[PDB]
């Protein structure tokens, strides 16, 4: 349980959400650009701090 | 401690022919044994309760019988329905124990392989990984040979995968996945899929010149 | 009608610890018996615990004991199995079966199943790759189209076609490992009116990692 932040993700195929536990929220994008990537998402990343929740949309 | 054995292990039968699987207890269970079958990836089904009732939605074709130490249950016609695995239970005294399970494979008419090859996604290259598959699908005999030539030269970085019968149209699938690097893939060009199955002397065989557009 | 679901499932380290849940309904939950039965993947199922109607009686087999704690709230009808030392083999899929009343001495009802694997792994989500045909007649009248879910572990992943409304002829293929990562394929064969006309969307879930992504499969468009 060490810190619990989400990815949204609505790219041109790719519509969905993972998930990844981290220690900084600039932990979480490092992780998440990387699995974005992986996946071929490619676009504009905002993030909310209430919610934990980063999101990727093109 | 009870101990269920079940035998044969594995059988193969033509639709429409009799089958008979065996459960023995290691003492009695009077007739406190079920059986429960579990077609491919479901959770198991109750099937035969006490050790010859028949439970929601068997019909008569299927019979189970025992008494204290030998139990059988009965296909009378086997069928395509029927494809799965038979877990018998005793229930008499804890712990509660069963037996390994029986496959029922369909024996069938042989039926010659459907072979796509698909081309790895502008994605998966993105992130500097070509990865090439090939379906063949629906034969019978599960018996079959992929052969990955690159340009028409041969390798080892496959990775391949089988299905349970279909359970409607008895029936096998494969899935042969030549994983290879950006700059590999890359500094190669034609991508065969061959495959020879006993329905065919001549090889099925999968193409794909890169046309990239 | 009777209805029964795991939960709780997931990665966990050897020596671990995890609490797995089963929502009973559709049925009086107390007035029956219930049961933890796993399955390995290799065998058959292995019976894991017992509770009688109201917790009074409780049995273990021997495997679990002093480790496994099996309870029950009635009164919001779901039971559990809180598990304590995971081990490498306590890795399987869990179901809860009901009883049953005479003459019913079987598992009665199953639930779903909750995987739980221990292990030191990392939990990794999987990678979706469209398989996409998109230029080349390949028909009889039917296109196939697949999806390919490479790179994670623990297992598993579902893939539905369409949220399910693509039962059709739908092949997904067991997971190899390569390097502590599954990789799996999935397909399905339409007919020549829809590849692109309709969209044909592959579902895919990674419980462990809770990921439930749609990859829409376009024509490769050249």
């Known amino acids: 349980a060490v810190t619990t932040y989400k990815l949204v993700i609505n790219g041109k195929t790719l519509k969905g959400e993972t998930t990844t536990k981290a220690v900084d929220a600039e932990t979480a994008e490092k992780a998440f650009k990387q699995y974005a990537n992986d996946n071929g998402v490619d676009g504009v990343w905002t993030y909310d701090d209430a919610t934990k929740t980063f999101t990727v949309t093109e | 401690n009870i101990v269920m054995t079940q035998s044969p292990k594995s059988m193969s039968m033509s639709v429409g022919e009799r089958v008979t699987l065996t459960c023995k207890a290691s003492?009695?269970?009077?007739?406190?044994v079920s059986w429960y079958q579990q077609k491919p990836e479901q959770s198991p089904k109750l099937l035969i309760y006490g050790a010859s009732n028949r439970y929601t939605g068997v019909p008569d074709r299927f019979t189970g019988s025992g008494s204290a130490t030998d139990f059988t249950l009965t296909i009378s016609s086997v069928q395509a329905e029927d494809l799965a695995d038979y877990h018998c239970g005793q229930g008499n005294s804890y712990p509660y124990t069963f037996g390994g399970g029986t496959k029922l494979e369909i024996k069938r008419a042989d039926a010659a392989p459907t072979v796509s090859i698909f081309p790895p996604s502008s994605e998966q290259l993105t992130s500097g990984g070509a990865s090439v598959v090939c379906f063949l699908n629906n034969f019978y005999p599960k018996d079959i040979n992929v052969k990955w030539k690159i340009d028409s030269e041969r390798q080892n970085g496959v990775l391949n995968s089988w299905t349970d019968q279909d359970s409607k149209d008895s029936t096998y699938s494969m899935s042969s996945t030549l994983t290879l690097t950006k700059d590999e893939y890359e500094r190669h060009n034609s991508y065969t899929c061959e495959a020879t199955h006993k329905t065919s002397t001549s090889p099925i065989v999968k193409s794909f010149n890169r046309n990239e557009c | 009608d009777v209805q029964l679901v795991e939960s709780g499932g997931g990665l966990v380290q050897p020596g671990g610890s995890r609490k797995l849940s089963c929502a009973a309904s559709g049925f009086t939950f107390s007035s029956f018996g219930m049961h933890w039965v796993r399955q390995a993947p290799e065998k058959g199922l292995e019976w894991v615990a017992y509770?009688?109607?109201?917790?009074?009686?409780?049995h273990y087999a021997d495997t679990v004991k002093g480790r496994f704690t099996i309870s029950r709230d009635n009164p919001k009808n779901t039971l559990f199995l809180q598990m304590t030392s995971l081990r490498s083999e306590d890795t399987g899929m869990y179901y809860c079966?009901?009883?049953?009343?005479?003459?019913?001495?079987?598992?009665?009802?199953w639930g779903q199943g909750t995987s739980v694997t221990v292990s030191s792994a990392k939990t990794t989500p999987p990678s979706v790759y469209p398989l996409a045909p998109g230029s080349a007649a390949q028909t009889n009248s039917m296109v196939t189209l697949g999806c390919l879910v490479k790179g994670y572990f623990p297992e598993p992943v579902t893939v539905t076609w369409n949220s399910g409304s693509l039962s059709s002829g739908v092949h997904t293929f067991p997971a190899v490992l390569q390097s502590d990562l599954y990789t799996l394929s999935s397909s399905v064969t339409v007919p020549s009116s829809p590849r692109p006309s309709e969209t044909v969307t592959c579902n895919v879930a990674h419980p462990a990692s809770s990921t439930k992504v749609d990859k829409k499969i376009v024509p490769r468009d050249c």
């Open positions: 079966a009901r009883w049953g009343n005479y003459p019913y001495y079987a598992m009665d009802y």
């Open positions: 003492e009695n269970v009077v007739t406190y």
């Open positions: 509770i009688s109607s109201g917790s009074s009686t409780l």
